[PDB]
Amino acid sequence: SMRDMLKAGVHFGHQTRYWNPKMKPFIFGARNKVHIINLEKTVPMFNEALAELNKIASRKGKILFVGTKRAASEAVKDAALSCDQFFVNHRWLGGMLTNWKTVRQSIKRLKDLETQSQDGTFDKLTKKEALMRTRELEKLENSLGGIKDMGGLPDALFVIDADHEHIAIKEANNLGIPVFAIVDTNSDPDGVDFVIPGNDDAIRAVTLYLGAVAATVREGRS
RNA sequence: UCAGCUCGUGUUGUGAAAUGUUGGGUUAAGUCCCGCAACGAGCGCAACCCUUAUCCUUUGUUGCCAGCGGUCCGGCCGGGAA
Ligand SMILES: [K+]
Ligand SMILES: [K+]
Ligand SMILES: [Mg+2]
Ligand SMILES: [Mg+2]
């Protein structure tokens, strides 16, 4: 709803100087040298994206949430876990999708290390070796924790800030994976299949998007 | 004995190529961490080997002599295993 979005601060945009001219249709206007996104445009476009996401969920298609920004990192994890969907909330590895075959090997290493930790193999290691393994496991977990159970290419991508996650979008476009993304005034919307014009900086705005997308997929799954 | 030299897949470039391997620190070291369109891997680095420095255990002659006994004063002898 528009009332919730204005409360969330979805309408707030970046400063006019950093705008991308392709975003002009979505922008309502500028106040205090800050672009204001037209919520009237956002609400129908958000609804259309949610409807498609619901359909993909009904088909049992895997959904990947990307939110590398630290502010939204935890929220992206929680929303994906809530809907039992895969996520990436730390730096996106270039070639995660395009070079999935190579990236899979790291996933296999992560799960092996996890089992070894549970096994107590680390105890057999001479402390230092265990520490190295532990450090490796932590790094692998942060990067590949969300996609460890994905076991293939995601059927759809939901992205926060298209500009920040340009690599991920470019990979998705290459592999013909549909992209759903929140595009702020500064960002370019050409890559995204389904564009949602909203603030991506604000956690409150981010949570609103994530809550809705998690809910719609969950209904699709049911 | 210098810390270099490369590859697969991905990505960028019409292309030769590039990236990875650069960057911020750090190291004897492409050593390590962090960052990062790269993600991984191999040969090198290091370690694994030999010798040297300390200690313990076992063994005690052809090596040893602290404590005993005796001396031809030489562990020399009976001994002892320190
Ligand atoms: K050129
Ligand atoms: K290459
Ligand atoms: Mg090395
Ligand atoms: Mg060596």
Swiss-Prot record:
Residue intervals passing through the bilayer: none
InterPro entries hit by this protein: Ribosomal_uS2 (IPR001865), Ribosomal_uS2_bac/mit/plastid (IPR005706), Ribosomal_uS2_CS (IPR018130), Ribosomal_uS2_flav_dom_sf (IPR023591)
Positions of post-translational N6-succinyllysine modification: 111
Pfam family, one: Ribosomal_S2
Keyword Aminoacyl-tRNA synthetase among UniProt keywords: no
UniProt GO BP: cytoplasmic translation; ribosomal small subunit assembly
Single GO MF descriptor: zinc ion binding
Keyword flag Ribonucleoprotein: yes
PROSITE patterns (UniProt xref): RIBOSOMAL_S2_1, RIBOSOMAL_S2_2
Keyword line: Ribonucleoprotein, Ribosomal protein
PANTHER family with a match to the protein in the record: 30S RIBOSOMAL PROTEIN S2 PROKARYOTIC AND ORGANELLAR (PTHR12534), SMALL RIBOSOMAL SUBUNIT PROTEIN US2M (PTHR12534:SF0)
Function per UniProt: Required for ribosomal protein bS1 (rpsA) to bind to the 30S subunit.
NCBIfam families associated with the record: rpsB_bact
Subunit structure: Part of the 30S ribosomal subunit, contacts bS1. Some nascent polypeptide chains are able to cross-link to this protein in situ. In collided ribosomes contacts ribosome rescue factor SmrB.
Protein name: Small ribosomal subunit protein uS2
Organism: Escherichia coli (strain K12)
Gene: rpsB
